[PDB]
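RETRY 2/3 - previous attempt timed out on the joint model. Re-submitting the same 1522-residue input unchanged.
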Amino acid sequence: APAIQILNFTFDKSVITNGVPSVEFTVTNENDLPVVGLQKMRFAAAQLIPQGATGAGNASQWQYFGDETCDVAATCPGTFVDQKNGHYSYTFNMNLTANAKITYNDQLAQRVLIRAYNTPLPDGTQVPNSNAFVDFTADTGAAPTYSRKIVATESCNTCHQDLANVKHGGAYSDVNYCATCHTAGKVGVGKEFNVLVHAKHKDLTLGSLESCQSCHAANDAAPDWGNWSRIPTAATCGSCHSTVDFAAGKGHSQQLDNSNCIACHNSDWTAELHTGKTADKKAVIAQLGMQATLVGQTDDTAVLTVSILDKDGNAIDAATVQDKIKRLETVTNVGPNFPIMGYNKSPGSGAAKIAKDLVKDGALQAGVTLVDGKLVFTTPALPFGTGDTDTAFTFIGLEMCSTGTSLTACTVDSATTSMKAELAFGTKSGNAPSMRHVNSVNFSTCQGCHSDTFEIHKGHHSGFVMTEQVSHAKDANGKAIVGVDGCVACHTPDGTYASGANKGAFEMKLHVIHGEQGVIKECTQCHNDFNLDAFKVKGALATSAGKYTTPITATCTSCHAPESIGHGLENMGAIVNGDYVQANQAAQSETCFYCHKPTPTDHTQVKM
Amino acid sequence: KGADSCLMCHKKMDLFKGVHGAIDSSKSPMAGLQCEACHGPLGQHNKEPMITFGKQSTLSAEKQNSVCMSCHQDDKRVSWNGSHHDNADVACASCHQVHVAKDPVLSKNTEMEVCTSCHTKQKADMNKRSSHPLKWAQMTCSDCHNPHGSMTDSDLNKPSINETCYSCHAEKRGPKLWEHAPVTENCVTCHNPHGSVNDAMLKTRAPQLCQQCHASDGHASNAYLGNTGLGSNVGDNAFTGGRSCLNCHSQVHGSNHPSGKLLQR
Amino acid sequence: VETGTSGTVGVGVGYNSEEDIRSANAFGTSNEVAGKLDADVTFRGEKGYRASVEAYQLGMDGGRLEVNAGKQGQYNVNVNYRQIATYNSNSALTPYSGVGSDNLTLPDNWVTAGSSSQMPLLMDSLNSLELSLKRERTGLGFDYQGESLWSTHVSYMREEKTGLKKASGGFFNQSMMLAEPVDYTTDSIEAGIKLKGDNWFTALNYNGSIFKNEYNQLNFDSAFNPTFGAQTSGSIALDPDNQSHTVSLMGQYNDSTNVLSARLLTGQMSQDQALVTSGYGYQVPTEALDAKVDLIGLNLKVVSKVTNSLRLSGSYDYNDRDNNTQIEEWTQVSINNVNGKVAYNTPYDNTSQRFKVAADYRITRGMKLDGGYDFRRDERNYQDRETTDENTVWARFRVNSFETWDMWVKGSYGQRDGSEYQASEWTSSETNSLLRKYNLANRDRTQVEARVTHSPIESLTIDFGARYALDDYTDTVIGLTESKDTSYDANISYMITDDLLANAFYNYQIIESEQAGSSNYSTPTWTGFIEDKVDVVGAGISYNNLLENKLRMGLDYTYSDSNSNTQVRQGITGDYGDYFAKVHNINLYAQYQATEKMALRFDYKIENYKDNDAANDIAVNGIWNVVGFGDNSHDYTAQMIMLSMSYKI
Ligand code: HEC
Ligand code: HEC
Ligand code: HEC
Ligand code: HEC
Ligand code: HEC
Ligand code: HEC
Ligand code: HEC
Ligand code: HEC
Ligand code: HEC
Ligand code: HEC
Ligand code: HEC
Ligand code: HEC
Ligand SMILES: [Ca+2]
Ligand SMILES: [Ca+2]
Ligand SMILES: [Ca+2]
Ligand SMILES: [Ca+2]
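RETRY 2/3 succeeded.
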């Protein structure tokens, strides 16, 4: 019954006899038990040209001989042998000396690949699509002198989760397999891997791709990972630098081949100019922190005190860097588990969020003062209430003028950097503050795609770098959780400035934005859990201008067109785009989770 | 006195048309002991110790050099007494001969044929592809060596290997602003002074020579496989073809250019 | 005549074709037809006045002349002349004009391009040039001997060197082969005072050298489009006018039991040439250098006879050069930095001191044994290793007595080690931590040589020997790893007392070097195998016809095969192509003593020469980023003759 999860391969003997390849291997499952009865497999053979053999400055390059698919129940060109103990062997039909395109060379390091199809065993057990490969010397079958193992599947999976998702119907899950097939002669010019992948990511904004280390880092499965700086060539550099024609001498001096590139473009130069902008960024972000406190008053106002911190976290006299602050931006709301102040004025409370910049262009703004070296500002009165609305909260973003790794006095022409954001809580009663959940979405998942220096909303705003500076909770292993709970100070249930038109409420915003991105394919990419109980303190959410929807329905229709739900929604005590009072009367009358039992791993699950 | 008579018994042949048959100066025959000095008649032969039978050739006695040494220790025959020749039981007579006009060894057309009789290695070396022009006697071993031995290691006429090269290659004497360390230290860290298969008398040439000392990351430390069958011809690149590394680093013997540190200009 | 002018003078003329100028080395000159003027004449008869002039092959290369005069035993004044000339090629092609000049220019109609394959006017423009170097040394000397002890020496020669060298000027990777002009004039001066005694003598010598290059920089237009930096013309700094001066005091104490030799030496080499600023857009810290290097030497040798069975010797030598040129900040050009990379000059200092001791024990006349130990220590500046120390122990054993055989064999084993190896900070890019520059690395050099000569019959003799050396760098993991040299040789001579003499030789040598390197600036990934080998054979016949019209003639044959083969292995193995020189030399000579007061001789030599460098077998536009000189290969058969005549006068 226990359908096979993992196929793990061990190669015992691998060679070429008079030009015919032969492999003998062992297969075992996730608990190291032999796997017997394998039905369908594709076998591929290849050859590695070393650095320089094609020309000085040229990189190492595979030659793809070809593939054969063996089905035990049907055709199989070669000789497939099951020792019915976990051990197997295959002998190819092809003879490499007979290849029309490639002169087989007994001395080149050889490689043989296996795609194990998803065909189930004769006894009915499921087999997962798998892939394995081996590197061997043609005659002796031993480890070769040289290799081309540059990038590792782990690095791609940071964003793609499983490389199979990407192309060719899931047939291929290990980047070495792609790297071997995508070589000169096998695929078209321009689709070689050292050019194809760069070209498919160059025009993407993802922050992690701003540095070569998102794909080119030290890793045990990549002994050649450092080639990323040592093998400059026209094809691979030009894959990102498409404006240059080296042969013509347009945009660069003429380069009729790659003999000379390495002479000018030494490893250290290539490396710094492509990693330096990220390093500078981290270097400047690291210099200042922020801690804020927020105190409720008897007159329903709130005193916000902001404290700028040094590299080690000790407070500093803020006037010492006032001249370097481009914008210190605050946003204050009430009710962290469900903000009751809209971006504009809310239909209920009638209040709009409190948006105040503490510093603009080096200058303290109206109503802000310096006390013990700290910034202080007192809000207009806020709609304090009972329970959750006993807690007011404020989100703080800092944008500093900079140069390189330096903070500099701000000028008209000045570069900026968004610094570590801060989150602060305070109450009117003086009792302990309520706080929103962080246990369903960890900011760490984003870092994979967006980098640890995601300057969110840099541009029209100060920008927000989410760090443990905002953390107020820890996980199972005891590590600090960075949540995105601060964002709801603007992304309120009542939307942002269009009050529903852009579906601003945070419960929906990221979903709409990212449902339209083909890289996003599983809820596990942000979600470690769904906190469904949270809906129990939710009201209705604005889904178009001025009209509201019960929260579960609102969340699902971020991706699911309301009309496309066959079974209908008003049936379920739902209200979809009704007026405020109607919708929030029905906020807790939704029937969805009586049926729908979603997990991040499969959200379509149901119990009737 | 004089003893003018040893001559008439002997076949009136050994013409004394040469320097030691001359008469004017106070050395050798006149105002001196004539055929006594080199042979020795207290009581002349036809008479071993204190006797007049000095052999003087390749034949009988050895360590007979004593006699010509009483007369010839100038600045050049110093270090002779422990010289590789003296300790090899080589004699002033095996090289020089007095009893004919002008000595062959001091023709420079011939000083090779005499030296190569024992030093057979050099007779290979100056037939090699490159070497100093000794074959047709534009030069000989006296130009570099002193056969009587010097205080320098291979009996070179100058006090060190580099100042013996500078006597003819003064262009290369220091001090330059940016000098290549091996060149300054010892010229035969790269060159073979007798000859070589490779041009310019190099022990090794083109890129591999430099790659023995230069191992920095990049183009100095890559494998230049040359002719490969898989695409890389040997003369299709500036690293193995042409002058190899010297197409871009031509000043291999040093530079006096403000920007010459990489031996470029 | 014993008194008065006496001797012989002669002349000669010779012809040669073809015009490939390597033939000019075997021949006297380059010209189609040669000129010669030999001489040897002597005067005496004026109270000891003597006045000889001798002249070898004057009128062509190798030419020499020496005239002397004065009183036989008081003084002598001589004047000399020597000519050397080596010819390299006349097959090279360059688009540059002003060849042999300070300034190499392209036509004003020239069209730059990004590579030689794409320069439209390159082929059309190529003019032929001749690579060759010629030396003309004229000297003059006074020599005054004293009555008793003191004699003095003073001499002065001036060499004028002219011709053309191969040079490369480019901008970063764009490169042009340029005709570097050479118009050198180097003066030498010697002056010495010697005091000589019964069993001692002291000398005081002054030697001086003065190099003067006519041209001090080489300017050239760029055949290429301007690359980064935006230059149309370069300026190479040529060899600067320099000079060197030195005085050595020497002392010898002779004695039947012991002898002591000493040499003291002090000198200074100077260079004050103004610096090149053309084509250089940064500020020099000085308009001119004042580089000085100070030399000091000390030499000590004692050789004593402890008994007559054995002789013991010791030596000590010390040679220290201290460059105290003045350090400054020099702006280097850099492709990575537009404002230049600043570098300090590193004036290298070199000290050497050696200590050695030996022993020559004659067990028996005809059988001598010799044994010695040598220590050397060299200290250095600004480099991977501070100090290197070698201990070598050696011996030699000669055996002449038994039969007509005469044998001897010698063996030496030396270990070089030194201080901590750690790469310099003074390079622009730090070397691999595993690299060992071979002149600094720990080495074990062991060489053994044996030679035998046997002559059973008289009128024949056969000598043969064998040599083997091995430099093994044990702790070198990147760099030169091992170099082994093995030689054989066999020479034979004989005659049936026929009064024609014959000989034959064959010598063979191979030098096998083996190195490693690392593409990923770590542990090795490739290895290089170089094989530098030579075979040379020859035989000659010579017949002196005695008791007749004093004829004498001879025939000589020699063939050499110099050959290099290098191989690199990284993953696979590649090799460099043909690198060889194969040459046949035959020399046929014959002289007839016709007319008693005259004699005539006739020479005829054929030279079949063929050389090929696979790297330079390409055309001018053969490599895209370089402008070459073209194919350098030679294959020619040269037919040369000469007549000569000598009349007694
Ligand atoms: C053969 C064994 C393959 C391996 C494994 C993978 N790919 Fe592939 N792919 C292959 C071919 C012949 C082609 C056609 C292109 C051509 O003209 O020959 C492709 C195509 C792609 C493309 C798009 C190409 C385009 O024309 O723009 C992509 C993006 C691509 N392949 C990616 C990819 C990935 C991610 C791989 C493994 C994870 C992979 N390929 C394996 C052949 C083979
Ligand atoms: C994933 C999106 C990558 C990004 C980001 C960068 N590179 Fe890359 N590179 C990538 C792949 C999948 C490969 C081919 C691996 C193979 O086995 O064929 C490469 C290859 C290179 C190379 C070639 C090295 C060689 O041929 O030996 C270079 C020089 C290279 N990449 C450079 C480079 C730089 C400088 C990067 C950031 C600026 C960079 N790559 C990003 C995948 C990805
Ligand atoms: C006001 C001070 C804001 C805070 C704090 C945050 N966001 Fe925002 N966001 C804001 C506005 C006015 C808008 C445009 C209108 C709209 O609702 O879309 C946005 C938009 C986004 C989007 C959409 C994509 C885009 O247009 O770039 C995303 C994905 C988004 N916001 C996310 C986001 C997050 C993650 C924040 C805190 C971690 C956050 N916003 C804070 C206003 C404000
Ligand atoms: C980021 C790239 C997202 C991925 C992909 C998906 N979700 Fe999400 N979700 C995201 C955010 C930032 C939040 C709001 C957190 C808050 O404090 O308000 C949510 C919320 C939900 C919820 C509500 C439950 C909760 O944990 O708060 C649900 C029920 C939900 N998301 C469902 C869901 C599904 C089914 C997804 C894939 C099919 C999915 N989300 C992807 C961010 C992201
Ligand atoms: C006859 C009365 C002689 C007188 C007077 C001198 N020499 Fe002589 N000598 C004589 C003969 C017949 C020979 C030939 C010996 C032979 O074996 O044929 C010699 C030989 C010499 C030699 C050569 C020795 C050798 O190699 O065999 C020398 C160097 C020599 N003689 C010197 C010499 C001197 C210096 C004399 C006067 C001081 C003198 N000889 C007188 C016969 C006679
Ligand atoms: C070859 C094995 C030699 C032996 C042994 C000795 N001499 Fe020599 N000598 C030899 C050469 C090739 C020359 C050429 C001049 C030069 O530039 O080296 C000389 C020269 C002399 C001279 C002339 C002045 C001089 O060159 O110093 C003298 C006075 C002289 N030689 C004496 C001499 C003595 C005393 C020897 C043995 C103890 C001796 N020579 C041996 C070659 C060889
Ligand atoms: C290697 C590190 C070397 C040292 C030490 C010395 N020289 Fe050199 N020399 C070297 C090379 C690679 C070449 C080839 C030049 C070419 O055009 O291919 C040469 C050549 C010479 C020459 C001929 C050309 C020249 O530039 O003059 C001479 C006359 C020469 N070398 C002399 C020389 C002297 C005098 C040195 C120390 C005193 C010396 N070389 C050291 C490499 C190296
Ligand atoms: C042009 C086609 C070149 C040839 C051929 C070689 N080198 Fe080179 N080299 C070249 C440039 C443009 C540079 C850098 C210029 C700058 O301003 O940075 C260099 C630099 C070096 C260095 C210093 C840098 C380093 O890697 O340490 C060395 C030690 C060096 N070059 C050595 C070297 C060797 C050993 C060569 C053949 C084996 C060689 N270069 C060829 C341009 C060119
Ligand atoms: C993938 C994207 C690559 C590829 C594979 C390479 N480059 Fe290269 N490069 C890339 C970017 C996004 C930038 C801009 C970086 C910045 O300025 O912040 C650069 C920049 C350069 C530069 C700077 C010159 C300039 O535009 O001011 C150079 C010299 C450069 N990149 C060189 C280079 C070489 C030699 C490469 C192949 C080894 C190479 N790039 C690849 C993006 C990418
Ligand atoms: C000699 C100098 C060369 C060598 C032979 C090559 N390059 Fe390359 N390169 C060089 C410089 C001085 C610059 C400008 C750097 C800057 O502006 O800071 C460049 C630039 C590039 C770029 C960047 C494209 C851009 O300007 O946006 C690339 C991609 C590049 N160089 C690559 C490259 C290749 C592939 C080479 C040989 C195959 C090569 N260069 C040779 C200097 C030199
Ligand atoms: C100083 C040097 C002298 C002097 C002043 C004389 N000899 Fe005589 N001798 C000398 C040498 C170096 C040699 C061997 C090498 C050579 O011949 O050049 C000899 C040998 C002879 C011989 C052997 C036969 C021959 O010469 O071929 C004879 C016969 C001989 N020596 C005799 C001789 C006479 C008669 C002398 C004064 C009139 C005389 N020598 C002087 C070295 C020197
Ligand atoms: C034996 C030791 C060698 C060999 C055979 C060559 N070089 Fe060099 N070289 C050597 C030293 C000790 C140094 C000083 C720097 C160091 O300690 O490594 C150098 C320096 C250079 C430089 C300057 C580079 C810099 O400053 O970083 C260049 C450009 C250079 N050498 C070139 C070069 C070439 C072309 C060689 C063979 C033709 C070559 N070297 C051989 C020591 C040694
Ligand atoms: Ca905090
Ligand atoms: Ca909205
Ligand atoms: Ca001058
Ligand atoms: Ca010093």
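Chain B touches chain C through 107 residues (CB under 8 Å). Closing ticket.
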